[PDB]
Amino acid sequence: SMQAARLAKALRELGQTGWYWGSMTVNEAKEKLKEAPEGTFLIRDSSHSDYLLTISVKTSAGPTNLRIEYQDGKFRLDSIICVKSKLKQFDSVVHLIDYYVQMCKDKRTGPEAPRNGTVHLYLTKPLYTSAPSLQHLCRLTINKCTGAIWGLPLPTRLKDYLEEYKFQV
Amino acid sequence: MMYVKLISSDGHEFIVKREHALTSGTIKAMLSQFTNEVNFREIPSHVLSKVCMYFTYKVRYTNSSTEIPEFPIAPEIALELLMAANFLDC
Amino acid sequence: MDVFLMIRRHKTTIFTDAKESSTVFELKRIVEGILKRPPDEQRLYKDDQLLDDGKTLGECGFTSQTARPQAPATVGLAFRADDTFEALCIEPFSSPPELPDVMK
Ligand SMILES: O=C(Cc1ccc(F)cc1)N[C@@H](Cc1ccc(OP(=O)(O)O)cc1)C(=O)NCc1ccc(F)cc1
Structure with missing residues (x-):
């Protein structure tokens, strides 16, 4: 299917990033991000049966973790976080990350959390393997x-x- | 044998550790042909100098025991650097 | 701890590394192994300033923050020509072309 071909491409792109850590536990991510500047992030496989991938990102309070949902050929941030209409969907998971990095780079979102409950994701630089x-x-x-x-x-x-x-x- | 000499098209001579130069698949095929010397008749010094910094950075940062920093690349050299990198297979 | 350098003279550029606690004299020992000239036939420079052989590279200003593998610090080299040392002379690299309009 064209859905299957788009998922195969998304995973190929992931292998090109240099910041995909594959099998990495939540505690291993915590240790790896402990000393990194705020906004440093990586992507790794999720330990959860229902999710392929999880973002691990340094906040000022320490590393935190955000799962990525995949449903019917589309990736988006985990929807337990916010209503799905406020979590943009992408064919490509690297595209998803790029979008959120560029929002921060363009100073459209910052490290302060929004006050109306819209999505808060502060990403700066990836952690390369x-x-x-x-x-x-x-x-x-x-x-x-x-x-x-x-x-x-x-x-x-x-x-x-x-x-x-x-x-x- | 410890070092090799890489010469740019404009005559600049870059002396780098042999292990580092072997970062390039193309250089590796040449040494591991010909002397401990490679002439790049189509790569100029503003590009070759950057390639040599990349060798140092690649060898240093294979592990992630140290946070890997950004490798800076001026936009003005990126097109030529891309072609040189493709030619060098690194 | 580690500093990453380019030792430059005329159109020669040596890529090498040393410790922050390495001496200038130890640097000339690196140069001698490569370029086959003894330390007493060398002068090393940071910018226009002669470096004293007994100093550490940190004492001369080469720190891990300022001499990194992806942006090495430049050390100038001048050789002794019979009685006299040559003037320090580093030939510039070629200049990059103008950017195409799309990438400005
Ligand atoms: O991060 C943590 C706490 C934690 C930290 C370090 C550590 F070592 C262990 C636990 N809790 C997450 C849930 C979670 C856990 C594990 C996981 O990993 P997985 O089971 O491998 O997928 C995926 C998600 C969480 O409360 N997020 C809310 C949130 C919403 C928006 C936002 F922008 C960022 C974060």
Whole structure:
């Protein structure tokens, strides 16, 4: 199905991030984020039978954890948190993360929690498991400069590579 | 043998630890052909110097025992650096 | 603890690392192993300032915060030519091209 192909792609993208920690317990995440600056985050497999993935993020009070729901081909933040209409849905889980990082980068949301009960997620920098390839680091840099990769003065082989991962994080 | 010399298109000579240069799949195939010297006739020094910093950073930060910091890349070099990185397989 | 450096002279650039508690003299011992010139034929510099051989790299200002693997600090090198030391001379790297309009 096209649903299955979109989920396979989402997991491929996840393997390119360099900040997907796979099998990692909630306590191992807690230890890994303990000394990190506020907003440092990672993604890992959830321990919960009903969820694939969980975000672990440093807050000023310590690391906390937020599950990601997948339902009918769409990812969104765990809906026990807020009404689902306020939790944007994405075909791609890296896209989901990129959206929330960019909201903070653009200072549309900050570290202070909102006062009307809308979603509070302060993300700054990912915690890498390992240094990514230089090619991927260039890719991130180009993505932060433009979305119009098919006009770049690059060979088509390298545009294909940029097209595989258009995120800024 | 401990170090290797990488030469840019504009004549700059970069001396780097051999283990570090082996970060590049392309350099690795050349040494592990030819001397302990590789000439890059199409990579200029403002790019090759950055590639060498990436070698240092990749070797240092394979483990995550230390928080991995950001590797800075000026937008003005990113297109050439992407091509060099692709050529070098790193 | 660890500092990451580029030792630069004319169009030579050595990528190497040392400890914050390493001495300038120990740095010249690195240079001698690579470039085959003894320490008494070397002068090392931070910017325009001659570094005293007996100082640690931290005492000269090379700290882990300012000499990182992804942004190494630059140490200038000048050799002794017979009686006289050469002027410090570091050749610049090439200049990057202008950005395409889409990425400005
Ligand atoms: O974080 C914690 C406390 C905790 C911290 C460190 C630690 F070592 C163990 C527990 N409690 C979570 C639930 C939770 C737990 C475990 C998990 O991991 P999983 O079972 O592996 O999926 C997933 C979720 C929670 O109260 N969140 C509310 C919330 C809402 C909005 C927001 F933006 C961020 C957070």
